[PDB]
Design a protein around this nucleic acid. Structure first.
Ligand SMILES: [Mg+2]
Ligand SMILES: [Mg+2]
Ligand SMILES: [Mg+2]
Ligand SMILES: [Mg+2]
Ligand SMILES: [Mg+2]
Ligand SMILES: [Mg+2]
Ligand SMILES: [Mg+2]
Ligand SMILES: [Mg+2]
Ligand SMILES: [Mg+2]
Ligand SMILES: [Mg+2]
Ligand SMILES: [Mg+2]
Ligand SMILES: [Mg+2]
Ligand SMILES: [Mg+2]
Ligand SMILES: [Mg+2]
Ligand SMILES: [Mg+2]
Ligand SMILES: [Mg+2]
Ligand SMILES: [Mg+2]
Ligand SMILES: [Mg+2]
Ligand SMILES: [Mg+2]
Ligand SMILES: [Mg+2]
Ligand SMILES: [Mg+2]
Ligand SMILES: [Mg+2]
Ligand SMILES: [Mg+2]
Ligand SMILES: [Mg+2]
Ligand SMILES: [Mg+2]
Ligand SMILES: [Mg+2]
Ligand SMILES: [Mg+2]
Ligand SMILES: [Mg+2]
Ligand SMILES: [Mg+2]
Ligand SMILES: [Mg+2]
Ligand SMILES: [Mg+2]
Ligand SMILES: [Mg+2]
Ligand SMILES: [Mg+2]
Ligand SMILES: [Mg+2]
Ligand SMILES: [Mg+2]
Ligand SMILES: [Mg+2]
Ligand SMILES: [Mg+2]
Ligand SMILES: [Mg+2]
Ligand SMILES: [Mg+2]
Ligand SMILES: [Mg+2]
Ligand SMILES: [Mg+2]
Ligand SMILES: [Mg+2]
Ligand SMILES: [Mg+2]
Ligand SMILES: [Mg+2]
Ligand SMILES: [Mg+2]
Ligand SMILES: [Mg+2]
Ligand SMILES: [Mg+2]
Lengths: 97, 95
RNA sequence: GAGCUGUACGUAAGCGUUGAUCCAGAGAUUUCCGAAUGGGGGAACCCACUAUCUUUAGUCGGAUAGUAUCCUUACGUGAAUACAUAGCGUGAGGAAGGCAGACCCAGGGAACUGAAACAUCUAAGUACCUGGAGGAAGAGAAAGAAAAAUCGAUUUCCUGAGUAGCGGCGAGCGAAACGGAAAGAGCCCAAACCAAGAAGCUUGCUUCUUGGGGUUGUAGGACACUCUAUAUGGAGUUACAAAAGAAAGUUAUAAAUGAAGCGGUCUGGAAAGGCCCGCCAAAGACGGUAACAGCCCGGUAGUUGAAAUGGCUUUCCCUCCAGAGUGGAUCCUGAGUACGGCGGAACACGUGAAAUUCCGUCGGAAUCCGGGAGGACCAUCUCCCAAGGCUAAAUACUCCCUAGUGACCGAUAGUGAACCAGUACCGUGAGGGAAAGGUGAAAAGCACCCCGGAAGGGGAGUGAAACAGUUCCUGAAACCGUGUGCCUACAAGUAGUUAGAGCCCGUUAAUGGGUGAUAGCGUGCCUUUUGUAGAAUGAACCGGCGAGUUACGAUUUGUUGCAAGGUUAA
RNA sequence: GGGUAGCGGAGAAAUUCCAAUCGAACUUGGAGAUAGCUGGUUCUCUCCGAAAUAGCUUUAGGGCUAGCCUCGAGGUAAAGA
RNA sequence: GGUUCGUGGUAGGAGAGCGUUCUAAGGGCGGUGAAGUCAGACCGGAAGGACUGGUGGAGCGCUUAGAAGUGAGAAUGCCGGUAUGAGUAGCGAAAGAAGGGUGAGAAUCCCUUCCACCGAAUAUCUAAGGUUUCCUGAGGAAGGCUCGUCCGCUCAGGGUU
RNA sequence: GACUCGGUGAAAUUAUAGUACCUGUGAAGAUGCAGGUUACCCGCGACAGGACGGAAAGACCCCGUGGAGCUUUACUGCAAC
């Protein structure tokens, strides 16, 4: 309350809407995939057991933050172009599920 | 109560400890007991119908039962009391 | 198992081991008023009638029983009106009223208040009224939730989430499903059709009654067909049908038994306390006892116990009972319903794009090739089958009972009420509503003497104490007095303070205490104010009581743990 | 002896009366209504220490943001005086 | 451990503390006298704390920590007590007097005589309303605006056909 | 009635008071502050100038986004017709 001066929130307009079908993904930056031992294929359920993601909202997306070292065969629901260009760069196969 | 009228008791607490006597009355509602020659008080009595001349009467005042132990008529000693069922009626026993 | 005839600080007559008083179960009696019910009535009163006894020579009296109203139902009688029917009478059942101001369901339903006004909105479907009531109620076995390519009745808790949303898009209001738990349980009808009646003329066909049958989704049933059961088994009064009983077990409602110190000394009125010795402990709970006790008492742990009544649990009796498969020719599967318009309401959802649910009014389907929902609507797909009913548990509350607990109160507190309190008192009434606890261990409650009419006192005596003396533990302050060390009748005083003779004292003994001639200085306290000694406010005084708290969220600092992890909720 | 009762009665009318209450009775409840107003708010010492202005406000004795106080922390060619 | 600069303060911020009730643990005091209460010339920078003696007659400190119904001088606060005003206002319409009696005590009770007042009432009935106030005996704490031997008051007994 | 005596015995009010006057001063009208001037201590009967005396949180006046009653061609409603 501003003692009768129109409150800030009423001076400025409402914006946008909420998408009913919004999809938020669980993020897994590369640096945390170094936790796995070379040759291993990395599925969602494996990322649960290791405790890197606890809840898998919509699905698992892989992003390119840091850098990877181990030739993994990663499979996640989505991939950053950069993440896909960095897993292969090392010598691994990305497949989408 | 562990003693009744007619019993010989020992007094174990108060100004008359070590003195024994014959329980003259029992007042179980108050857990009190009147012992012959024990807790003698001086009652300043106006003349009336009973005691018509009046006078300062030396008489017995009640003692709390917990202050008397039953005299085992066998050994003439104070005792705690048990209860044993002898055919018909239960009877007090000593220790 | 020895005392007893309630309290309460009396006299009298009595009772009790031939078992009292007392405790528990069952029974009997239970005036009058009160729904109050034979009629009436200003509650606790008045006055009857009908039987049947009873009293009197008869009136006059007495006793016992019946006699309200409505509803349902049977049987009788029975008008206008001919049969009827209404009406009337009698006999069965049932209701009525109360309340636990709680909890629950339903009808009806505010306002202050918030929105810094206010009307939509909020408060709030709250308070309150009325009805139904039950031990719980309500809800409930999908025309569901969804969108895995799946859940499987309802309820409650955690969570989702202060999200999605609603909203003069203001103030505010605010879900649900998924996920996790508690608890779990499922069932009976209506209808096809079958059988047996009655009632009807539809006149051999329809409409009602009772029984069998039958209950569900690309289906189930009827109906045909076949296979086994016709109590072999199964189930049950908590739904699923409904009354009944027995027995044994257990629990409750009275109780019983129950170890060990009169230990020695000290102080003391008294020892349970000190000091010094022992002992019991499945018992060192609590209380009492002349101060603080495991060993003094009632008890406590442990172990026994019930004639009677009730509850619960088993078991028996008793009662009750058909289930599979195969075919979709035909038949059935809840109608003034579902839906729709109009007006409202409930849904978190304020008419909105408004699905879903309910009410009033009007209109009004399909009806297995059928129907509903998935948030306008259409199509597809998916899930479901309404318009009938029942159903325990997990949940809510506490007038009560039993056993307990408290970093809850301790007499201005804690209940309004520790005390004969919803009393006294106030009020026409509804209604409002106090104050008031403590002798002592024991009455041993002050014989006797003295002054006094008494009250009251002084002695004497009791007691540890009476300066504990029947409103009696302690006994502060205000306030009222008596006595006297210092000062005071030439003084102008917010009362003190600093300086200070004189006089009187002598302490927690230290550059002490009381008083204060005289001198200097000096405008209470609080509140509120630019500013108050204020001729502004508040307080007669003293005492008690009397105001930033808790819950749940937010944020930030500090601490601690763990750390790209941390943490669980119910 | 009776009748009319508060969103109401009664009134040869005054806002007059309805139990010493009446421009809307009394009582209990909603209810601890609300009160930007007044009053009040209880122990001690230490360190610091304002403001009584601006803007906007159905605002003017209220409020909000800023200014001025305080506590902590940070960086900081010290930028302040 | 020392130098330097500081130390007036309302609203207000910050800090450290005193004391109260309760709990825990530890350690104590106390019938050879606990708490409370009274007194004092003691101790600490403050809140405050001791010690000694009286009263009192059974409980209470201390330490560390914890928790709060945690501190009053003001609210025309609430309740209780007690002042002040003050021996003051008042003692509620009115005619009494003496003698005798009663009694511990008499202006105030009883009796006598005289006097005075009401008399369309201040008389006599009765209804309402009250509900024992009526009668007798005893009483004089309180009530009665004084007093009190008296009473519509207190206590017993009675009394309504 | 007052007053004196005997009996009985309230109240409003009240920060504590050893409570003069004048002129000044001060929140602008002082018993209480300053400078002076007066004044032995304690009462009783009287009188009301002052204590901005007592009584009543001013009725006037303003303020409050306080009420209430009343009006209407204020707004929005509702009964009734
Ligand atoms: Mg928009
Ligand atoms: Mg009757
Ligand atoms: Mg407002
Ligand atoms: Mg024993
Ligand atoms: Mg001794
Ligand atoms: Mg004692
Ligand atoms: Mg004791
Ligand atoms: Mg529909
Ligand atoms: Mg509609
Ligand atoms: Mg709504
Ligand atoms: Mg639809
Ligand atoms: Mg409709
Ligand atoms: Mg849709
Ligand atoms: Mg939606
Ligand atoms: Mg169906
Ligand atoms: Mg009380
Ligand atoms: Mg007390
Ligand atoms: Mg006393
Ligand atoms: Mg002179
Ligand atoms: Mg002199
Ligand atoms: Mg003055
Ligand atoms: Mg005043
Ligand atoms: Mg915080
Ligand atoms: Mg007028
Ligand atoms: Mg009146
Ligand atoms: Mg309210
Ligand atoms: Mg209030
Ligand atoms: Mg400073
Ligand atoms: Mg504006
Ligand atoms: Mg200085
Ligand atoms: Mg300072
Ligand atoms: Mg104490
Ligand atoms: Mg307090
Ligand atoms: Mg006070
Ligand atoms: Mg006077
Ligand atoms: Mg006078
Ligand atoms: Mg006079
Ligand atoms: Mg008179
Ligand atoms: Mg005349
Ligand atoms: Mg008389
Ligand atoms: Mg008198
Ligand atoms: Mg008399
Ligand atoms: Mg006089
Ligand atoms: Mg002067
Ligand atoms: Mg005068
Ligand atoms: Mg005045
Ligand atoms: Mg005023």
């Amino acid at each position: 309350f501003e003692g009768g001066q129109l409150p800030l929130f009423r001076r400025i307009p409402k914006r946008g809407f909420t998408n009913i079908n919004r999809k938020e993904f669980a993020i897994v930056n590369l640096d945390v995939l170094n936790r796995f031992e070379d040759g291993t294929e990395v599925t969602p359920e494996l990322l649960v057991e290791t405790g890197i993601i606890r809840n898998e909202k919509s699905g698992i997306k892989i992003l390119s933050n840091g850098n990877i070292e181990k030739k993994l065969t990663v499979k996640a629901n989505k991939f950053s172009a950069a993440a896909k260009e960095a897993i292969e760069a090392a010598g691994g196969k990305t497949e989408v599920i | 109560m562990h003693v009744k009228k007619g019993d010989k008791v020992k007094v174990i607490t108060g100004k008359d400890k070590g003195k024994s006597g014959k329980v003259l009355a029992a007042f179980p509602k108050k857990d009190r007991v009147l012992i012959e020659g024990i807790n003698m008080v001086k009652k300043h009595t106006k003349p009336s119908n009973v005691n018509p001349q009046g006078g300062i009467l030396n008489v017995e005042a009640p003692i709390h039962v917990s202050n008397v132990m039953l005299l085992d008529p066998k050994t003439g000693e104070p005792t705690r009391v048990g209860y044993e069922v002898k055919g018909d009626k239960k009877v007090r026993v000593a220790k």
